Every structure is written in C-alpha cells, then in structure tokens.
Structure 1
Amino acid sequence: EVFSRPEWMILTCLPVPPPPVRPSISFNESQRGEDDLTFKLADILKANISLETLEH
C-alpha cells in the first residue's frame, strides 16, 4: 500500500538522473562527449515530443 502499488509498475513520470550518473566526459573547449545514457534519454525525450505533438 505504501511503497509498492501495482499501478507504479507502469511509468507516467520518468525520472532523469543527474549528470554524475551520465558524465559528460567534456574534453577540450570546442568538443564535448556526452554519455550513452544522455543519448538514450535524449532519444526518449525526442520520441516523447513526437507522440505529444502527434496526439494533440
């Protein structure tokens, strides 16, 4: 009832982990170097907006 309700096994609000979980290994001034997880989240975000605009 308090910590694990079946309804929460389905996601509606997706938590975004802070940079130390997905470190931008930013080498040099001009270059960056974002982590895999940053791309997957950006991939999730891109996919979300397509759907959000599409249904609206």
Structure 2
Amino acid sequence: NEDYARPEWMIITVLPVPPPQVRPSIAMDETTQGQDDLTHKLSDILKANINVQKLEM
C-alpha cells in the first residue's frame, strides 16, 4: 500500500525507543535495582551504533 505499507520501510534506518513504561526496572533488593532486558539490549544496540560511527570516520 502506497499510503501505509511501503516496501522500503521493511528496512530499518531509524529505530523507535520505547518509553520506560514498556521496559520497567525492578528493585532486586533494598539498594540495587535491576535494568530490564530491553534496556540492556538497547544499550548494546546503541554501543554498536556508536562503534560503527566511530570506525567509519
């Protein structure tokens, strides 16, 4: 569909980052809280993006 599903949109060029409501953090004990799995995966993705940008230039 030209308006809604264009074929080139199947390739990701910009990634949407969900709000913390989607990936809430949990307090494992009284002091240390735990980052969610999605948060760690997004951190890894962003590190890889930074690495690619640094290497390219």
TM-score, normalization by structure 2: 0.86
- Per-residue deviation, residues 1-55 of structure 1 (Å, max 9, x unmatched): 1110011000111000000111111355642211000000001000110001100
Q: How many corresponding residue pairs?
A: 56
Partner SS for 1:21: coil
Identity of counterpart residues, as a percentage? Answer: 64
Task: Say what the alpha-carbon RMSD is for the aligned residues.
Answer: 1.4
Q: Distance in 1 between matches of 2:38 and 2:56?
A: 27
Runs in 1 of length 4+ with deviation above 3 angstroms? 26-30
TM-score, normalization by structure 1: 0.88
Unaligned residue ranges in structure 2 (runs of 5+): none
Kindly indicate which of the two structures has a greater share of residues assigned to helix.
Answer: 1
Unaligned residue ranges in structure 1 (runs of 5+): none
Kindly indicate which of the two structures has a greater share of residues assigned to strand.
Answer: 2
